[PDB]
Design a protein around this motif. Structure first.
Motif, PDB file in Angstrom:
ATOM      1  N   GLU A  78       0.832  -1.195   0.000  1.00 33.65           N
ATOM      2  CA  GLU A  78       0.000   0.000   0.000  1.00 33.65           C
ATOM      3  C   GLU A  78       0.871   1.251   0.000  1.00 33.65           C
ATOM      4  N   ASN A  79       0.490   2.233  -0.811  1.00 32.63           N
ATOM      5  CA  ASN A  79       1.217   3.487  -0.935  1.00 32.63           C
ATOM      6  C   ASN A  79       0.369   4.628  -0.395  1.00 32.63           C
ATOM      7  N   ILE A  80       1.013   5.566   0.294  1.00 36.64           N
ATOM      8  CA  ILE A  80       0.345   6.710   0.903  1.00 36.64           C
ATOM      9  C   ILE A  80       0.819   7.967   0.190  1.00 36.64           C
ATOM     10  N   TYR A  81      -0.127   8.769  -0.290  1.00 38.20           N
ATOM     11  CA  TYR A  81       0.160  10.016  -0.988  1.00 38.20           C
ATOM     12  C   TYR A  81      -0.464  11.157  -0.195  1.00 38.20           C
ATOM     13  N   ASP A  82       0.367  12.084   0.273  1.00 36.78           N
ATOM     14  CA  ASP A  82      -0.104  13.226   1.041  1.00 36.78           C
ATOM     15  C   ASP A  82       0.485  14.550   0.578  1.00 36.78           C
ATOM     16  N   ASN A  83       1.408  14.534  -0.377  1.00 39.45           N
ATOM     17  CA  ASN A  83       2.022  15.757  -0.879  1.00 39.45           C
ATOM     18  C   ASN A  83       2.677  15.431  -2.215  1.00 39.45           C
ATOM     19  N   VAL A  84       3.056  16.485  -2.940  1.00 35.90           N
ATOM     20  CA  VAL A  84       3.725  16.298  -4.224  1.00 35.90           C
ATOM     21  C   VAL A  84       5.109  15.696  -4.023  1.00 35.90           C
ATOM     22  N   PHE A  85       5.840  16.174  -3.020  1.00 38.29           N
ATOM     23  CA  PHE A  85       7.186  15.701  -2.741  1.00 38.29           C
ATOM     24  C   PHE A  85       7.171  14.714  -1.581  1.00 38.29           C
ATOM     25  N   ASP A  86       8.112  13.774  -1.626  1.00 36.89           N
ATOM     26  CA  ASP A  86       8.232  12.738  -0.609  1.00 36.89           C
ATOM     27  C   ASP A  86       9.612  12.840   0.016  1.00 36.89           C
ATOM     28  N   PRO A 135       9.772  13.577  -6.083  1.00 35.87           N
ATOM     29  CA  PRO A 135       8.326  13.449  -6.315  1.00 35.87           C
ATOM     30  C   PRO A 135       7.792  12.184  -5.659  1.00 35.87           C
ATOM     31  N   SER A 136       6.592  12.283  -5.088  1.00 38.47           N
ATOM     32  CA  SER A 136       5.977  11.162  -4.387  1.00 38.47           C
ATOM     33  C   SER A 136       5.699  10.012  -5.344  1.00 38.47           C
ATOM     34  N   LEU A 137       5.422  10.338  -6.602  1.00 38.70           N
ATOM     35  CA  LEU A 137       5.113   9.354  -7.628  1.00 38.70           C
ATOM     36  C   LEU A 137       6.342   8.893  -8.399  1.00 38.70           C
ATOM     37  N   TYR A 138       7.527   8.935  -7.793  1.00 31.80           N
ATOM     38  CA  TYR A 138       8.756   8.586  -8.499  1.00 31.80           C
ATOM     39  C   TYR A 138       9.131   7.121  -8.286  1.00 31.80           C
ATOM     40  N   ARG A 139       9.245   6.695  -7.031  1.00 35.13           N
ATOM     41  CA  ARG A 139       9.625   5.331  -6.703  1.00 35.13           C
ATOM     42  C   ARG A 139       8.625   4.727  -5.726  1.00 35.13           C
ATOM     43  N   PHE A 149      -8.260  18.567  -1.550  1.00 26.52           N
ATOM     44  CA  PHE A 149      -7.043  17.894  -1.112  1.00 26.52           C
ATOM     45  C   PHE A 149      -6.483  16.991  -2.205  1.00 26.52           C
ATOM     46  N   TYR A 150      -7.352  16.289  -2.934  1.00 30.29           N
ATOM     47  CA  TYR A 150      -6.891  15.440  -4.029  1.00 30.29           C
ATOM     48  C   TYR A 150      -6.280  16.272  -5.146  1.00 30.29           C
ATOM     49  N   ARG A 151      -6.849  17.447  -5.407  1.00 26.61           N
ATOM     50  CA  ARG A 151      -6.294  18.341  -6.417  1.00 26.61           C
ATOM     51  C   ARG A 151      -4.964  18.925  -5.963  1.00 26.61           C
ATOM     52  N   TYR A 152      -4.729  18.946  -4.652  1.00 25.83           N
ATOM     53  CA  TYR A 152      -3.539  19.572  -4.091  1.00 25.83           C
ATOM     54  C   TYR A 152      -2.346  18.628  -4.009  1.00 25.83           C
ATOM     55  N   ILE A 153      -2.570  17.316  -3.881  1.00 26.24           N
ATOM     56  CA  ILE A 153      -1.455  16.371  -3.839  1.00 26.24           C
ATOM     57  C   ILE A 153      -0.948  15.994  -5.219  1.00 26.24           C
ATOM     58  N   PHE A 154      -1.589  16.477  -6.284  1.00 31.33           N
ATOM     59  CA  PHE A 154      -1.154  16.203  -7.649  1.00 31.33           C
ATOM     60  C   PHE A 154      -0.889  17.489  -8.422  1.00 31.33           C
ATOM     61  N   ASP A 155      -0.769  18.616  -7.727  1.00 29.15           N
ATOM     62  CA  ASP A 155      -0.586  19.924  -8.353  1.00 29.15           C
ATOM     63  C   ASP A 155       0.894  20.280  -8.273  1.00 29.15           C
ATOM     64  N   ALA A 156       1.660  19.831  -9.269  1.00 24.74           N
ATOM     65  CA  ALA A 156       3.086  20.137  -9.295  1.00 24.74           C
ATOM     66  C   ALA A 156       3.331  21.593  -9.662  1.00 24.74           C
TER      67      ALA A 156
END
Ligand code: SF4
Ligand SMILES: [Zn+2]
Ligand SMILES: [Zn+2]
Lengths: 169, 434, 380, 464
Positions: D297-305, D313-317, D402-409
């Motif tokens: 399971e992956n947790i996404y809460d911000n653009v950067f990790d 980027p949170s969506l990198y690895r 919030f969903y629009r904010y965690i994917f707004d690079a």
């Protein structure tokens, strides 16, 4: 004047219905006018006699958590008032002493009702309010602030040569 | 340069998102609040006044680079902001007077910026009729215009333009024989013209504000717009930087010196009261504890500070851990917010929780009597002229400007270079000066 | 919205039955009284004989609630949210002993014009999804349906959703390698292109299980822009629910399982020998809505401000299409032919579809003359 | 106008409704209070002529809950300075009668200390001290068993309750009926306790008769239930208005509750009168999606990790160390999972669950009553309270933002402090291909936010 509690929202209708269910003779004696047929209303039934409801007049004159007779005596009269549940009334018919309790309770409520009226000075106050407004005494005892002052304005305009609005319905 | 002036009429018919709706209102409140401060701290015709007002107008994006006529971003922002902010200030009469007063200073400033040639176009685009005269006619009636002019000394008739207006519109000028009249027209210079323009704008704005309050029940039902109508000046600062979190390094042995040099008057009085009586009431504890958290104290340091101070009050050490450690631990952490975790702001200190006898919290400039405040300032080693200035400012309800003056005179500088709206900001700017 | 619903239905019922006046719920009265209200349960569970309450209207009772005692009521049929008129005894003013339940009255039928009697015989085909088996993405039943449509060449084909089921195992586990929108357009293109030679008009009705669409009732029409000029004359996108006039014949189309929701929360006096479906259908026709039940099912989103203006029956329909998870049927109730063809796919095995003939007979006769002359529920 | 005058003379207005005004004076001398009161009289009567204010009474202490809901000490003035204080309560009655003896005993103590004549710091210290001890006593079993008995009266036969399973007193009455002799009927009262069975069942289904409590060995009293569901509601309804005291704080005094308790805490209750991104999105649920390859399971809460130098980027690895699959490759699955997660919250909002605002009632219903009070729908269980949505439209709106904010690079890059670091990683991870991927996930949440939910404000209706 006939004084009671919850007369205008219970006892008056129950009494009038029980009168015509058993076809009691001369129902009209409840009023002051000889009439043959009765309507199905309550205010018209007792013409000539003004009915005072302690429950209605208490709200206008004092603030209480509830306006039941038990609570009314507790605040104004400062005295406990026991109650008989309506389920137990049947079971008090099996012995002489028990049925005298039911009669004793009934009598005490009538004297309790008479006591709340005198302490709050409902009757002297009704006469004074009516004389200022200039309307019918049976109407101010029933309740309704707007109806009383409507007669005050109506008198004022008439003496100053005005045309008053027709009654709406 | 640009045509940013407008007589605010014909409400917008657009639609906007909620985020833009909130941002425009907040920005407009900030601008109008700073116009009053600039007016109080200076005079309307200095270089500093003009420079600071223009820089602020640049910063808040109410006049900037161009766009295609209609969706000119600054003009659109200005229009929508004004009409939004009418609703907030329509309610009370004191609010109405404030809004009317502050909205005219901005119009005066913007009219002071126009080039000498665009004024005629603005006037013609304005209500109905204003006209100028050429140099030939101006020289034809030069002597009569000069004679009709008021008692201003000399014959200095410069190059400033002269406008002809219907006599009725110049009523306040012609009933005193202060303008030249010729066939139902009056010849007026620039100053009286801008006075007339301001008076007309004031009348129209007062009429619109009086009319708006009548139809207010129709927006109060909206749940999204309740923070706007009621609370655009109540207890939350317009824009605040000194908040919870942040970084810092403060030693416990230094608080005594920073109290004398860096703390604002409110925190100074709280610190003195705590060091003297070894105890503080509930309001003082909250205010001073939140202030200490804001400047960089940590949980262990805060616990040690309050414990070591409260032991000298002749209590049992264990009673502190049983009763007072809970509140301090709660303060530094999670939910239970809006009064318990965010350090107090200047407006919140001023307009809420007034102190009583035995309470040492509140704002000195507001809750202290003028004589007691005078004696307090004397013990602060302040020059008598400074007291005279500060007490004059305080009398005019401008408490934060008085605190600004106190900052300036304590740090021995001419201008603070900032607007003060938070005690932690007062500490931070003082530390920056060092 | 709720108040207006109660007042309108009550006013019409009062006009029909010619009653004298309505009595407030809380007012004691020793003589029998006539109350107007809506039925509801006193808890969050299933309604039963002991938990019935009646909630009054704003004009008369100002939204008061009283318990209802059904011991002395002989025949009744009640579901939550039903606007009803009761006659009973209420002596204390805190409980009503119901004695008579007035029957509901439906809306008048559509009045044919002179043109509508000149139309000729037509055939209509009706199918409802899902159009694929629960363990596959192949969409074989869809191809079988397209083949049947091409063979029969009907006049109109009405297809109900879902086309991309939200409850499918692959959809709900997100194992698909394509966007939901693209798969939906794929399915729609497959349907449209495959039935081009037939010349039959196509009607698409959305569903609340369509993953790519808005999950709020009532639903707007599907979105599709990749249509040539030829296809715009044969393909039509309608909402849910819809009232559709096909050659002067009124069709009521709804994709929601109203029969399975109403039947799960409806109490009745007779249970030995009675038709449940006919009774539910009578409730639907006399309540004058496409969803009479309030509160709705647990997973059912309804927007009431739009439900008030977009989900009311205009007239009593001639044919009512009501797909459902229950067994297929065709019943004539109150002059309306109610047809339930079932789902095209049921579990891992195939389902059924329906076909109808329509031809309006001569104007005069014995009042009712149903334009629908033959119905047949057939296996796929 | 009157409110403005009073606050100008350093006085506080704590209530006013069209025929009454309550003013806090911060005074302890009664002689000064009347002198202070007569000054307000002249101030208002200066501007107008005929309207006149009049003194009604003086309270020596007040606990202002709501209109006609308070506990106060009324002052009855005797001759020449002295007075008598009378205890006076109104609107502080609990409709339910199913509270144990320990809960009712605790409740009278708290109300008793409030109506004392001591200062605020003394009241809170005494209340805190008692509550600390109570929590300790319950855990050690020093409380008598009879203190935990609860009595409820049946109104219907047990087999006629629709809620059946969720009602503890019905559950016990069913066991009495089927197990032994005598049968319970409508009107009878049932006594029960809540115990631990080790069966993980709900607290409603773990109700046992008092007799079976000592007769059986494998069960024991549930201390968690009584601390949180019996004691806490009674105390909190009185101590929440007190400044400096919060519902989470009472829980801390009682045990190890706070973190779990604040999850069950409210959201609207904090509304007493902009916010930062960290504090605005704190109650929103994180975005979760399992890896198609490893299943972690992956947790996404911000653009950067991460933070500092090693932030990516949170969506990198993938979060799994052993997994070498990049979530950025599996973009279609991420967008599909987003849609599934949004229909869930939209349906939750449209469910319509209303919950009563009174801590002792907490009535939960899906039916909207047609009887409204001034604030909102009026509760049908206790006829003096207002129902409130369990999931409001503001919570749904904030969740989609919030969903629009965690994917707004686009906005997460201008938020960086130094212009040098923003350049260093824009050329390192945020390739034009990567920027396009975040735009597709961002537009998924934007479709649902586009025209619906009134994030839109119509100015035409607002001004015209
Ligand atoms: S103006 Fe603000 S910083 Fe200065 S003393 Fe008052 S509250 Fe403190
Ligand atoms: Zn992985
Ligand atoms: Zn309630």
């Amino acid at each position: 004047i006939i004084v009671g509690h919850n007369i205008y929202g219970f006892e008056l209708e129950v009494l009038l219905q029980r009168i015509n269910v058993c076809k009691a003779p001369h129902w009209s004696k409840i009023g002051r006018l000889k009439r043959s047929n009765m309507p199905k209303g309550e205010r018209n039934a007792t013409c000539g006699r003004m009915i005072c409801d302690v429950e209605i007049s208490a709200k206008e004159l004092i603030r209480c958590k509830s306006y039941h007779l038990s609570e009314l005596v507790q605040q104004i009269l400062k005295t406990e008032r026991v109650v008989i549940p309506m389920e137990n009334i049947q079971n008090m018919y099996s012995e002489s002493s028990q049925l005298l309790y039911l009669l004793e309770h009934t009598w005490k409520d009538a004297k309790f009702i008479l006591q709340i009226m005198c302490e709050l000075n409902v009757l002297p106050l009704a006469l004074q309010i009516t004389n200022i407004a200039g309307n019918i005494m049976s109407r101010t005892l029933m309740g309704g602030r707007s109806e009383r002052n409507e007669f005050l304005l109506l008198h004022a305009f008439y003496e100053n040569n005005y045309i008053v609005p027709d009654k709406q319905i | 340069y640009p045509h940013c002036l407008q007589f605010y009429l014909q409400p917008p018919s657009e639609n906007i998102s909620l985020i833009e709706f909130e941002n425009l209102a907040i920005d407009r409140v900030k601008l109008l609040k700073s116009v009053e401060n600039l007016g109080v701290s200076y005079v309307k015709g200095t270089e500093q006044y003009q420079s600071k007002l223009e820089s602020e107008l640049r910063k808040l994006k109410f006049s900037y680079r161009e766009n295609l006529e209609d969706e000119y971003e600054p003009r659109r922002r200005d229009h929508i902001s004004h009409f939004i902010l009418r609703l907030a200030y329509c309610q009370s009469e004191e609010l109405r007077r404030w809004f009317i007063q502050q909205e005219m200073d901005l119009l005066r400033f913007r009219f002071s910026i126009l080039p000498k040639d665009k004024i005629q176009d603005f006037l013609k685009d304005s209500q109905l009729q204003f006209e100028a005269i050429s140099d030939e006619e101006k020289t034809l009636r030069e002597q009569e215009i000069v004679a009709s002019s008021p008692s201003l000394s000399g014959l200095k008739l410069g190059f400033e333009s002269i406008y002809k207006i219907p006599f009725a519109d110049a009523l306040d000028l012609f009933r005193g024989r202060k303008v030249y009249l010729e066939d139902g027209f009056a010849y007026v210079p620039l100053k009286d013209i801008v006075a007339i323009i301001l008076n007309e704008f004031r009348a129209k704005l007062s009429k619109a504000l009086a009319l708006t309050a009548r139809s207010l029940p129709a927006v109060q039902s909206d749940e999204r717009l309740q923070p706007l109508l009621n609370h655009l000046s109540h207890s939350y600062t317009g824009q605040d930087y000194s908040t919870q979190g942040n970084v810092g390094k403060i030693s416990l042995d230094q608080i005594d010196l920073l109290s004398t040099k860096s703390f604002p008057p409110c925190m100074r009085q709280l610190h003195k009261a705590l060091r003297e009586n070894h105890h503080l009431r509930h309001g003082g504890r909250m205010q001073y504890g939140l202030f200490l958290k804001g400047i960089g104290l940590t949980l262990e340091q805060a616990l040690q500070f309050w414990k070591q101070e409260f032991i000298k009050g002749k209590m049992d050490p264990d009673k502190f851990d049983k009763g007072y450690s809970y509140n301090i631990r709660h303060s530094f952490g999670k939910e239970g917010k809006r009064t318990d975790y965010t350090p107090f702001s200047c407006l919140k200190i001023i307009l809420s929780n007034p102190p009583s006898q035995g309470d040492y919290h509140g704002c000195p400039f507001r809750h202290s009597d003028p004589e007691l405040l005078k004696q307090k300032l004397q013990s602060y080693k302040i020059s008598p002229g400074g007291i005279s200035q500060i007490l004059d400012l305080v009398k005019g309800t401008h408490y934060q400007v008085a605190c600004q003056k106190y900052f300036e005179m304590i740090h021995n500088v001419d201008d603070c270079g900032f607007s003060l709206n938070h005690p932690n900001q007062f500490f931070c700017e003082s530390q920056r000066i060092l | 919205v709720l108040t207006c619903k109660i007042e309108e239905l009550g006013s019409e019922l009062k006009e029909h039955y010619k009653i004298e006046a309505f009595t407030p719920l809380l007012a004691p009265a020793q003589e029998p009284v006539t109350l107007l209200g809506q039925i509801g349960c006193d808890s969050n569970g299933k309604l039963n004989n002991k938990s019935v309450i009646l909630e009054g209207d704003r004009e008369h009772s100002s939204g008061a609630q009283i318990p209802v005692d059904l011991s002395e009521l002989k025949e009744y049929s009640l579901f939550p949210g039903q606007v009803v008129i009761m006659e009973g005894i209420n002596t204390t003013g805190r409980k009503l002993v119901a004695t008579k339940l007035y029957e509901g009255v439906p809306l008048p039928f559509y009045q044919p014009t002179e043109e509508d009697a000149d139309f000729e015989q037509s055939m209509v085909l009706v199918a409802c999804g899902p159009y694929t088996t629960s363990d596959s993405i192949t969409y074989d039943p869809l191809l079988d349906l397209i083949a049947v449509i091409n063979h029969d060449r009907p006049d109109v084909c009405i297809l109900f959703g879902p086309f991309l089921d939200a409850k499918h195992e692959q959809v709900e586990n997100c194992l698909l390698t394509s966007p939901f929108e693209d798969i939906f357009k794929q399915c729609l293109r497959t349907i449209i292109e495959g039935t081009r030679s037939s010349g039959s008009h196509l009607v698409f009705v959305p569903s609340l299980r369509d993953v790519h669409h808005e999950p709020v009732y009532p639903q707007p029409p599907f979105s599709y822009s990749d249509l040539s000029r030829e296809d715009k004359k044969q393909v039509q996108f309608v909402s849910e629910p819809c009232s559709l006039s096909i050659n002067g014949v009124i069709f009521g189309l709804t994709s929601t399982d109203l029969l399975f929701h109403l039947g799960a929360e409806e109490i009745s006096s007779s249970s030995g020998t009675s038709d449940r479906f006919s009774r539910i259908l009578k409730h639907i026709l006399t309540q004058r809505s496409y969803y009479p039940l309030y509160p709705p099912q647990e997973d059912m989103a309804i927007d009431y401000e739009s439900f008030y203006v977009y989900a009311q029956l205009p007239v009593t329909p001639d044919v009512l299409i009501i797909p459902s998870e229950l067994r297929y049927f065709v019943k004539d109730v109150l002059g309306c032919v109610c047809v339930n063809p079932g789902r095209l796919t049921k579990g891992q095995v195939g389902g059924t579809f329906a076909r109808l003939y329509l031809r309006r007979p001569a104007a005069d006769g014995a009042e009712r003359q149903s334009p629908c002359i033959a119905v047949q529920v057939v296996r796929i | 106008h009157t409110k403005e005058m009073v606050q100008k003379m350093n006085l506080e207005v704590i209530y006013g409704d069209t025929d009454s005004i309550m003013i806090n004076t911060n005074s302890t001398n009664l002689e000064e209070v009347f002198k202070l009161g007569n000054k307000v009289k002249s101030e208002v009567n200066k501007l107008y002529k005929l309207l006149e204010i009049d003194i009604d009474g003086v309270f020596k202490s007040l606990l202002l809950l709501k209109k006609k809901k308070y506990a106060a000490l009324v002052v009855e003035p005797t001759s020449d300075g002295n007075y008598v204080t009378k205890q006076e309560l109104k609107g502080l009655d609990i409709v339910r009668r199913d509270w144990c003896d320990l809960a009712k005993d605790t409740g009278n103590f708290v109300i008793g200390q409030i109506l004392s004549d001591q200062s605020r710091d003394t009241i809170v210290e005494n209340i805190q001290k008692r509550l600390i001890e109570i929590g300790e006593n319950v855990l050690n079993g020093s409380v008598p068993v009879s203190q935990f008995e609860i009595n409820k009266a049946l109104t219907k036969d047990p087999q006629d309750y629709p809620d059946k399973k969720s009602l503890p007193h019905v559950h016990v009455a069913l066991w009495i009926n089927s197990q032994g002799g005598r049968k319970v009927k409508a009107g009878d009262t049932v006594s029960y306790v809540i115990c631990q069975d080790g069966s993980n069942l709900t607290a409603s289904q773990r109700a046992y008769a008092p007799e079976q409590l000592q007769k059986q060995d494998n069960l024991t009293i549930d201390t968690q239930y009584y601390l949180a569901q019996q004691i806490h509601p009674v105390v909190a309804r009185i101590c929440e208005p007190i400044d400096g005291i919060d519902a989470v704080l009472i829980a801390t005094w009682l045990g190890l509750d706070p973190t779990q308790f604040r999850v069950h805490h409210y959201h609207k209750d904090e509304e007493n009168d902009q916010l930062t991104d960290e504090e605005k999105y704190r109650d929103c649920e994180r975005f979760k999606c399992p890896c198609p390859t490893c299943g972690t399971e992956n947790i996404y809460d911000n653009v950067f990790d991460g933070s500092g130098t090693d932030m990516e980027p949170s969506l990198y690895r993938c979060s799994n160390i052993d997994c070498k699959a990049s979530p950025l490759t599996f973009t279609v699955q991420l967008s599909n999972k987003l849609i599934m997660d949004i229909r869930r919250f939209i349906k939750k909002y449209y469910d319509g669950w209303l919950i009563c605002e009174e801590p002792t009632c907490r009535n939960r219903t899906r039916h909207l009553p047609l009887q409204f009070s001034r604030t909102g729908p009026l509760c049908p269980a206790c006829m003096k309270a207002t129902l409130q949505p369990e999931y409001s439209d503001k919570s749904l709106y904030t969740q989609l933002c919030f969903y629009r904010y965690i994917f707004d690079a686009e906005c997460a890059l201008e938020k960086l402090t130094t212009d040098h670091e923003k350049d260093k990683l824009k050329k390192q991870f945020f390739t034009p291909k990567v920027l396009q991927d975040y735009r597709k996930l961002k537009n998924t949440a934007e479709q649902f936010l586009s025209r619906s939910g009134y994030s839109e404000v119509n100015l035409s209706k607002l001004f015209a």
